[model samples]
Target: HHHHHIQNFRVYYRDSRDPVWKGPAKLLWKGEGAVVIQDNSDIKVVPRRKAKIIRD
Candidate 1:
């Protein structure tokens, strides 16, 4: 089987009813790899706790 790898995206929601979404996507073109996505306040990805990868 052929597998295509998708990059990890940091995400969260304001409330339970709110839809969880990715912060923002940077145009990491021209070989700029691993760009950080930020929030409205330009906060870098802050995980509330240790990130757990459900799948690998």
Candidate 2:
């Protein structure tokens, strides 16, 4: 049997082109190229360049 660990963390982002930071969105999954987050009923994929994980 296999089990999936529940990730208790959030994802924040700051676009390199923008000065201000955004997010604290629910983390969905992270990949080599991008990190996915949940915003209410929608989902967002943030590129690795702009994604940061907070485990607090």
Candidate 3:
């Protein structure tokens, strides 16, 4: 989801100590055209929290 046009969202984790995780979300509005969520670059995502995580 684009942060610029993000209306609102709910982060669920049972408690604040839990990782700030977000489940499935539906945006009520959009700012620009659809962008590939897989894109990873400073120009793509703003304020990216995790850009160095390994899935292995």
Candidate 4:
């Protein structure tokens, strides 16, 4: 058997009922890499205490 390593993405959503979504990617806080919270609000990503994983 073989394993496949996949990169996780930090996607954003307004509500669970809302079919629409936002943010296809960014660095998740728990990712195993260097994380940078910058002074630039334009590049900053916030976690609304929500997360989801896609297998597609």
Winner by TM-score: 2
lDDT tens per residue, model 1, 1-56: 42222345434323224445443332111112222233454434333331222222
Which 10-residue span in candidate 1 carries the lowest summed lDDT?
Answer: 26-35
Ordered from best to worst TM-score, the candidate numbers read 2, 4, 1, 3
Error of 2 at 54 (Å): 0.9
Per-residue error for 50 in candidate 3, Å, reads: 9.4
lDDT of 4 by residue, 1-56 (tens): 32222455444433445655644544334443332222223334333444343324
Residues 1-56, candidate 3: write the lDDT tens digits. Answer: 54442335321111234565433332223234332122222223212332222222
User: Would you list the rank order by lDDT, best first?
Assistant: 2, 4, 1, 3
Report the number of clashing residue pairs per model.
Answer: 0, 0, 0, 0
Ten consecutive residues with minimal summed lDDT in candidate 2?
A: 1-10
Query: How far in Å is the alpha carbon of 2 misplaced in model 1?
Result: 33
Q: Which stretches of candidate 1 lie over 4 Å from their true place?
A: 1-10, 13-37, 48-56
- For all candidates in order, the CA lDDT equals 0.31, 0.73, 0.29, 0.38
Error of 1 at 25 (Å): 8.9
List per-candidate RMSD values in Å: 10.8, 4.9, 12.4, 10.1
Task: Choose the strongest candidate by lDDT.
Answer: 2
Q: Total backbone clashes of model 2? A: 0
How far is 38's C-alpha from truth in model 2 (Å)?
1.1
